[PDB]
Design a protein around this ligand. Structure first.
Ligand code: RTP
Ligand code: RTP
Length: 1677
């Protein structure tokens, strides 16, 4: 172990760091009445003398010099010798050790003072009544007993039953329904208005208006079109971004002319030229939709439960008469659920489970679950399509696969600025038989009805829906059938009735009344849960995650949670059913193998099905009801204001508590270190606790320092660090300069009104738009910022008085949204000098910021080629380290920079590059400290062992309780599952300095650097609100009474943007240091509890930042000490004592999610009771239906199959797995890669062109369907589907039986050439069988759509986790708009000027006069330095021009252009049906399906010279270690009943193929297990040679393309070119594979040693660092 001091800061002490008086205040504030200042200093600087056994002697001299300097600067006489300090610190030990007993007495007094003040509620009903009483006390008379003023019961949209077959013959089936309703709505006027909820005083007077509006819109304002063209969209260039989807200017944006009406497309109509009485009727109907006063019903309303107990069974009657049999959602769900035998390889033993799944599918078919979900999905489609394009004088009649359903959509909030939603009136035709049940069910929203024929025509009430609510309505086919399947499985009456009957006898007719009632509840709950669009239902359902703990003890959650902080916001009826289910569960728990519920007689909360055989069924039902709700139905505008509003309040609370005023700095005070309640710690106890923690954790200072400076990439340049190189995002305050602003104002003349070209017109527009209403501040900015005062304003006078200028109005958000960003910059900056300063932080990549930092380190600001190339080559040139750049940044910004670097923004938080580097240093010097702690969970690599540590924390605790309580005394268990509240907001930050001073694995210079870093992070941090949000609050504050909650007080009345956030580190920034402090606090808790005299306590705790998993086992005289601690049992003891102890460590325990029990613990989401773990597969099942990224079909299908895989891991039953398959299929296919029957299908396209591939053999990237079985998807993952179909077509191609025959036939090198020649001859003369055409198709697909194709991992870093990739990559930007606003492009465009800057066509013309010379120079200084463009930067001049030589490849600007951005819905369902661009430069615009047709027609021919990709695709499949041993196990596995499996329910999968396959690869003994598998299954050991040699072939071709063209067999000389010409013999890839298969050189790298050999043939082996890298078979563990 060698020691290296990594600082120029060596001669700096922690008491001379500019912000050094705060350390003096911390020292002065730690002085107690028993410990003086001298002992505090001697302990704090000198604690390292307990660690002096593993550190160097130069480290000894360094730390003793730091000790002496600290004592001299603090006016204390230091000890002369190190042994003198050791003797003094070992003799003043009992003074410091006595703090634990006083702390024990303090927490006992705090429990005694806290339990006396609280009040006790007698029962749960009194808690509910007290909540209702205080709710009436806030707002009086808010509770109404009349059910006529409430909100809508049955949510956004209503689905009647569809009773008549509608024949179509030349009548356009979508349009025949509209004229059917029109001819129904032409009879007389027997309009009966509906009184809601059987009321008597019906006002009406609006039902007449709605009826007249609907009659007008269906009689006069619309007609049978049947001839107009469909809506077609086209991509267009935006003035701020690229490639947005919009309607074309002609055709589908123009109003056509039918007979006396105006029409746009097949659905939209208009009334621009209509009679005045008709216009009056239209406006009278429009005024209804608007184009305390809360009536909340009580929890104990017996009328609402009685009404719901008729509404929810009228719904079941309505869900029982539908006659439709085929559809889109029905087809995809019946692909998996109607025949689930294909998913399971050994399906012959699942004769009961698969039959139950088939019965659940038949019940879904007969109750019209699929058809209702499909109707909701397409109506949400049509509704948001209507939301963006509708005007006030137009409507958008929607029709679907329905028979008796329409919707009359009206003007919504196009160009979304929050808004309210899109109005819509739905019409229904119901027959005479189901007429009373329709009135009973939808009694609130039926607005008028009349009778025509044997039918009733219903007009329902208009509502409105935001885009988020339409998106939650969209995922109905993914959310409702899985709800029906899970609730039908977990209900024991439903499953019990399903098990006796047969598939031909399952119907509603042969049902008992109890099973029918359970089915009614299941249908109603699935409908109400799968589509949720109300905030009250979300409040009710996330109230449910705390009122659901049965096996419990004292938690302060049964009664004190249902008091004041519970919000009973029940607005409608029939959520009384859900709240009443909660109330019955709580009343049951009040009156009091896991068998938890066969004896308690528990009741399901949403589905009410009794006789619960297992507690895990209850946990699964509640948590699936919880996790299926959306994250938020609020807009991003409201959510961002909430996220920017919480820290302002939690900082104003801190300032008010500790006496700081609003506009001043933050310094330590005595109150923070005096053991107070709100914002304080104990002080001297914290120092002793941290010293004891560092004594007990760090065992070798030098070895751990070596691991820190070797594994965290210290003493290495910053581009080797993945956090500071991989472009996440960043924040750099780029503001147009004020001198540049006044210069642009000066050069903007008044004689060039026509010639206002360039970007200066944007500055002119911004200053004029600011002048139009903000005259008060523009004169101040024009007279104080610039030295010329009157000239600028007098020039602006005739600038506005020039007559012609393009400004409409200060429309605020309408100006911001669709104008150039520098217009926003100027419209800000001309009124921001002394107030409202903003200083807008625009986002940037960290790679560009690191590029600028490396450029600024070597003083190469102005870019010059000789200046960068003079830095040397190889591993002997100029190179920096991470800490040298860190101190360069610190020395730069300590020089009066204005503290612009400490500015974060919300985009979860967006910090600067400096703050990212300081947080990296502080984070990763404590990551290894937390890695040495066995009780620390955030240091666990991944989520794999997170469950494992909880398993140990249960197992050793239970084993020790079994080993102690049987001998001498009694023991009581106490498991704590705490979660702290405001872990970052309420936390004192200055206590982290004490964790750094006492750190022994450090240096007195590095410690000073970290202390100064944390002190500037506290004293100078600020938060900048974004421009649109701050303008919204500014205009709201101007219109209103000018008061705000906390943001107005912090920003001096909203007159400035940056508000101070000092003692609140942002969440995720200190995630290891806070966890270290938490574990230190728990060790101090154990040391404090060890001070009790006649009792023995041992504590086991587990810490992951915010969370806690404390266990405690007491022994001895328990009965006396329990009333000493003021409690009744050990969980009550633990919940009181830990809460009292944590207040001395600035940790706030909240009595909401923190419970204490004697048998149950929870950690994050996993949960283990009495040595057995409850599975909780709810999160993955909900992620299978709700969470998606919305980027592509391939990406989202591969991402959702992760959740399917973890569903298979965590014990899912075998009847929800086919529904999980169907759910991920609907969620992947329902946006862009369209559903069966639509335009972007892949079964239909492959069937039309006669492709030889079958339905279940289409690859995933071809738009095909996930058809991998249960076992290979569970073991390998989503990347196994294409591997399985490739292996199947290969095994059919060479006509073999097993994989081993294929392996020993491929292993001969003279075999695949003969097969390829035989295939070529077969294609030649006369014969091509089906297998040959399949093999040819997949060979050409591997050529055209391999994952390595058109990708390099050094421009954008990818991971290569699959075999193939997306074959259409839509460009997010067109031309060089993606490459702009970049320092790399601005440098590349300067030393290589506009001959090669603008544009891609100018560079492409240099491949067939000055651009050819520039390209020749580029590739001449590129090909002489080969290591700079296709490996990682070895040093500088391998990084600064590595970012410069990537803007020359056509496939490296395309890769940066089509980067996957976030976007949202309606930007991808519209782009899929639009004529999109192909690449970065093409005049041709073509659709997605036509592109797919062209690509499939391209990959149909044999295309000889395809031998290399044939051998590559064979060898990528067969050579996998995991696949080649998983397949023979699956092929030769015994069914059951010998050692594999003998149980039935949820015990085939976890007994037959996840334990005899885990005795397969690593060998194992355990029988039943929930699996956290190994790392990712590697299919990228062979693909990173493909990328790293494809880029070599590309630069070879682009180097050889200038001087000459040639074909082959080149004779030129100049060895680096002749050897690459010999390298390009066939493709260079078969040469790569064969040549480095038959030898293995493996020469080391020094870039002169390796360039000594040859530039081409053995050099490429040192551009991947490995060859034929075969991994080991992964242990599932
Ligand atoms: N992005 C939008 O279009 C939108 N959505 C809701 N809002 C807020 O609510 C009002 C109604 O929106 P509009 O801009 O369509 O109404 P308008 O201003 O009276 O009509 P117009 O566009 O023809 O001038 C608007 O005045 C505005 O305050 N704006
Ligand atoms: N009630 C609690 O016991 C609790 N648990 C966490 N927190 C801290 O609260 C900050 C923001 O709260 P959020 O609105 O994001 O939800 P949350 O974290 O789940 O807390 P809560 O249950 O109170 O809503 C978050 O920064 C979070 O750390 N409070």
């Amino acid at each position: 172990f060698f020691s290296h001091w990594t600082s120029k800061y060596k001669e700096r002490n922690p008491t001379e760091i500019a912000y050094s008086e705060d350390i003096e205040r911390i020292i002065d504030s730690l002085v107690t009445d028993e410990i003086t200042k001298e002992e505090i200093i001697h302990f704090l600087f000198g604690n390292f003398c307990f660690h002096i056994e593993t550190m160097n002697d130069q480290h000894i001299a360094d730390k003793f010099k730091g000790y002496q300097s600290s004592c001299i600067n603090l006016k204390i006489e230091p000890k002369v010798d190190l042994a003198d300090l050791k003797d003094h610190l070992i003799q003043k030990q009992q003074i410091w050790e006595s703090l634990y007993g006083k702390h024990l007495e303090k927490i006992m007094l705090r429990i005694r003072e806290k339990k006396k003040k609280e009040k006790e509620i007698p029962d749960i009903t009194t808690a509910f009544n007290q909540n209702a009483a205080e709710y009436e006390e806030k707002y009086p008379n808010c509770f109404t007993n009349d059910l006529s003023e409430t909100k809508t019961n049955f949510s956004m949209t209503w689905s009647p039953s569809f009773e008549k077959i509608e024949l179509s013959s030349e009548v356009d089936y979508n349009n025949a329904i509209i004229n059917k309703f029109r001819e129904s709505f032409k009879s007389s006027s027997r309009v009966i208005y509906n009184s809601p909820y059987s009321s008597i005083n019906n006002q009406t007077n609006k039902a007449r208006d709605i009826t007249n509006l609907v009659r007008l819109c269906l009689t006069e304002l619309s007609c049978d079109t049947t001839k107009m063209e469909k809506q077609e969209l086209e991509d267009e260039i935006d003035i701020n971004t690229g490639s947005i989807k919009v309607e074309r200017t002609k055709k589908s944006k123009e109003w056509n002319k039918q007979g006396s009406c105006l029409t746009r497309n097949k659905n939209e109509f208009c009334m621009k030229e209509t009679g005045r009485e008709n216009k009056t009727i239209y406006f009278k109907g429009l005024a209804v939709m608007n184009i305390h006063m809360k009536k909340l019903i009580r929890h104990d309303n017996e009328d609402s439960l009685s009404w719901c107990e008729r509404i929810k069974d009228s719904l079941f009657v309505l869900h029982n008469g539908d006659i439709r049999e085929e559809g889109k959602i029905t087809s995809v769900y019946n692909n998996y659920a109607k025949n689930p035998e294909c998913l399971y390889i050994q399906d012959s033993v699942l004769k009961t489970e698969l039959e139950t799944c088939k019965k659940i599918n038949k019940l879904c078919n007969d109750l019209a679950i699929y058809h209702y979900s499909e109707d909701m999905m397409q109506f949400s489609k049509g509704l948001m399509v209507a939301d963006r394009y509708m005007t006030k004088e137009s409507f958008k009649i929607l029709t679907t696969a329905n028979t008796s359903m329409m919707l009359l959509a009206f003007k919504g909030d196009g160009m979304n600025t929050g808004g309210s939603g899109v109005p819509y009136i739905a019409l229904h035709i119901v027959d005479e038989d189901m007429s009373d049940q329709f009135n009973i069910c939808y009694t609130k929203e039926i607005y008028s009805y009349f009778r025509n024929g044997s039918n009733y025509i219903y007009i329902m009430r208009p509502q409105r829906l935001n885009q988020v609510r339409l998106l939650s309505l969209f995922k109905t086919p993914s959310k409702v059938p899985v709800c029906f399947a899970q609730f039908s499985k977990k209900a024991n009456e439903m499953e019990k009735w399903l098990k006796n009957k047969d598939i031909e006898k399952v119907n509603v007719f042969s049902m008992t009344m109890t099973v029918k009632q359970i089915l009614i509840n299941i249908v109603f709950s699935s409908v109400m849960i799968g589509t949720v669009t109300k905030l009250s239902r979300m409040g009710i359902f996330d109230f449910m995650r705390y009122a659901g703990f049965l096996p419990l003890s004292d938690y302060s959650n049964i009664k004190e949670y249902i008091r004041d902080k519970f919000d009973p916001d029940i607005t409608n009826v029939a959520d009384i059913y859900f709240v009443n289910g909660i109330k019955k569960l709580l009343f049951r728990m009040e009156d009091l193998d896991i068998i938890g519920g066969i004896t308690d007689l528990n009741i399901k909360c949403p589905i009410t099905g009794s006789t619960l055989l297992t507690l895990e069924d209850l946990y699964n039902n509640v948590y699936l009801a919880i996790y299926m709700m959306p994250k938020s139905l609020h807009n991003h505008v409201h959510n961002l204001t909430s996220l920017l509003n919480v820290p302002a309040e939690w900082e104003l609370k801190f300032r008010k508590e500790l006496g700081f005023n609003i506009f001043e700095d933050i310094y330590p005070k005595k109150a923070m270190f005096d053991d107070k309640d709100l914002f304080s710690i104990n002080g001297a106890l914290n120092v002793k606790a941290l010293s004891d923690y560092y004594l007990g954790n760090i065992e070798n200072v030098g070895l751990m320092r070596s691991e820190i400076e070797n594994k965290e990439d210290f003493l290495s340049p910053c581009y080797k660090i993945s956090t500071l190189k991989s472009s996440k995002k960043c924040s750099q305050s780029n503001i147009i300069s004020t001198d540049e602003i006044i210069e642009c104002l000066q050069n903007a003349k008044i004689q060039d009104i026509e010639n206002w070209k360039g970007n200066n017109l944007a500055i002119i527009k911004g200053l004029i738009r600011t002048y139009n209403e903000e005259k008060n501040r523009l004169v101040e900015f024009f007279e104080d910022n610039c030295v010329n005062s009157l000239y600028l304003v007098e020039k602006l006078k005739e600038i506005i008085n020039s007559g012609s200028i393009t400004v409409g109005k200060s429309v605020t958000s309408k100006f911001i949204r669709n104008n150039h960003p520098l217009t926003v910059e100027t419209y800000l900056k001309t009124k921001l000098y002394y107030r409202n300063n903003v200083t807008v932080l625009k986002s940037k990549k960290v790679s560009e910021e690191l590029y600028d930092l490396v450029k600024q380190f070597h003083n190469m600001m102005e870019i010059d080629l000789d200046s960068v190339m003079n830095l040397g080559k190889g591993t002997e040139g100029k190179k920096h380290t991470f800490l040298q750049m860190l101190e360069f940044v610190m020395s730069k910004a300590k020089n009066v920079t204005g503290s612009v670097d400490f500015l974060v923004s919300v985009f979860i938080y967006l910090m600067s590059m400096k703050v990212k580097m300081m947080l990296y240093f502080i984070e990763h010097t404590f990551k290894h400290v937390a890695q040495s702690d066995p009780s620390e969970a955030i240091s666990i690599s991944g989520d794999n062992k997170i469950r494992a540590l909880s398993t140990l924390s249960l197992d050793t605790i239970t084993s020790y309780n079994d080993i102690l309580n049987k001998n001498s005394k009694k023991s009581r268990l106490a498991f704590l599952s705490a979660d702290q509240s405001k872990w970052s907001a309420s936390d004192l930050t200055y206590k982290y300095v004490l964790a750094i001073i006492l750190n022994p694995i450090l240096t007195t210079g590095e410690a000073s650097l970290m202390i100064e870093c944390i002190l500037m992070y506290v004293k100078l941090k600020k938060v900048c609100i974004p421009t649109d949000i701050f303008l919204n609050l500014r205009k709201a504050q101007g219109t209103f009474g000018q008061n705000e909650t906390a943001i107005g007080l912090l920003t001096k009345g909203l007159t400035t943007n940056t508000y101070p956030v000092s003692m609140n580190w942002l969440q995720g920034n200190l995630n290891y240091l806070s966890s270290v402090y938490h574990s230190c606090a728990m060790k101090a808790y154990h040391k404090t509890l060890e001070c009790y005299k006649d009792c023995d306590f041992q504590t086991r705790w587990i810490v992951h930042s915010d969370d806690n998993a404390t266990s405690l086992i007491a022994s001895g005289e328990v009965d006396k000490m329990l009333t000493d601690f003021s409690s009744s049992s050990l969980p009550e003891m633990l919940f009181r004592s830990i809460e009292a102890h944590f207040k001395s460590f600035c940790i706030t325990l909240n009595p909401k999610k923190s419970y204490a029990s004697s048998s149950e613990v929870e950690f994050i989401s996993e949960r283990i009771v009495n040595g057995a773990i409850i599975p909780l597969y709810c999160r993955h099942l909900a992620n299978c239906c709700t969470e998606s990224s919305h980027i592509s079909y391939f990406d989202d299908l591969m991402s959702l199959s992760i959740h399917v895989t973890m569903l298979l891991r965590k014990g899912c039953p075998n009847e929800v797995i086919p529904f999980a398959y169907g759910a991920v299929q609907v969620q992947a296919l329902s946006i862009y890669s369209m559903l069966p029957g639509e335009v972007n299908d892949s079964i239909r396209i492959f069937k039309k062109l006669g492709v030889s591939l079958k339905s279940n053999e289409i690859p995933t990237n071809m738009g095909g369907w996930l058809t991998s079985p249960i076992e290979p998807l569970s073991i390998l993952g989503p990347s196994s589907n294409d591997q399985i179909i490739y292996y199947n077509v290969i095994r059919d191609f060479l006509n073999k039986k097993s994989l081993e025959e294929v392996k020993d036939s491929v292993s001969s090198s003279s075999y695949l050439q003969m097969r390829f020649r035989e295939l070529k001859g077969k294609y030649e003369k006369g014969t091509l069988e089906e297998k040959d055409k399949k093999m040819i198709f997949l060979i050409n697909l591997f050529e055209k759509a391999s994952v390595s194709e058109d990708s390099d991992v050094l421009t954008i870093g990818m991971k290569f986790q699959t075999m193939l990739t997306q074959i259409i990559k839509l460009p997010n930007f067109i031309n060089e708009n993606a490459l702009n606003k970049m320092s790399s492009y601005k440098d590349f465009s300067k030393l290589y000027p506009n001959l090669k800057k603008n544009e891609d066509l100018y560079k492409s013309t240099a491949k067939n006069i000055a651009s050819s010379l520039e390209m020749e120079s580029v590739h001449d200084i590129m090909i002489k330095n080969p290591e700079t463009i296709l490996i990682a930067p070895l040093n500088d001049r391998d990084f600064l021009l590595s970012q410069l030589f990537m803007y020359t490849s056509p496939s490296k600007r395309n890769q940066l252009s089509n980067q996957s951005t976030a976007k949202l819905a309606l930007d991808r369902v519209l782009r899929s049906k639009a004529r999109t661009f192909v690449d970065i430069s093409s005049t041709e615009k073509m659709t997605y399906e036509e592109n797919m047709e062209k690509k499939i027609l391209e990959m149909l021919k044999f295309d000889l010279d395809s031998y290399c990709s044939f051998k590559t695709c064979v060898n990528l499949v067969i050579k996998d270690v995991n696949f080649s041993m998983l397949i023979p196990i699956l092929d030769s596995a015994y069914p059951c009943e010998s050692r594999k499996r003998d149980n039935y329910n949820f015990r085939w999968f976890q007994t037959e193929k996840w334990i005899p396959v885990v005795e397969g690869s690593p060998g194992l003994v355990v029988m039943h297990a929930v699996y956290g598998s190994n790392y990712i299954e590697n299919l990228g050991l062979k693909n990173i040679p493909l990328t790293d040699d494809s880029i070599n072939v590309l630069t070879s071709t682009f180097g050889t393309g200038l001087i000459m063209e040639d074909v082959k067999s080149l004779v030129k000389g100049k060895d680096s070119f002749e050897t690459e010409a010999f390298s390009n013999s066939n493709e260079c890839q078969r040469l790569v594979k064969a040549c480095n298969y038959m030898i293995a050189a493996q020469n080391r790298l020094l870039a002169i040693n390796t360039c000594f050999t040859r530039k081409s043939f053995p050099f490429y082996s040192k551009f991947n660092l490995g060859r034929g890298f075969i991994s080991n078979t992964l242990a599932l563990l």
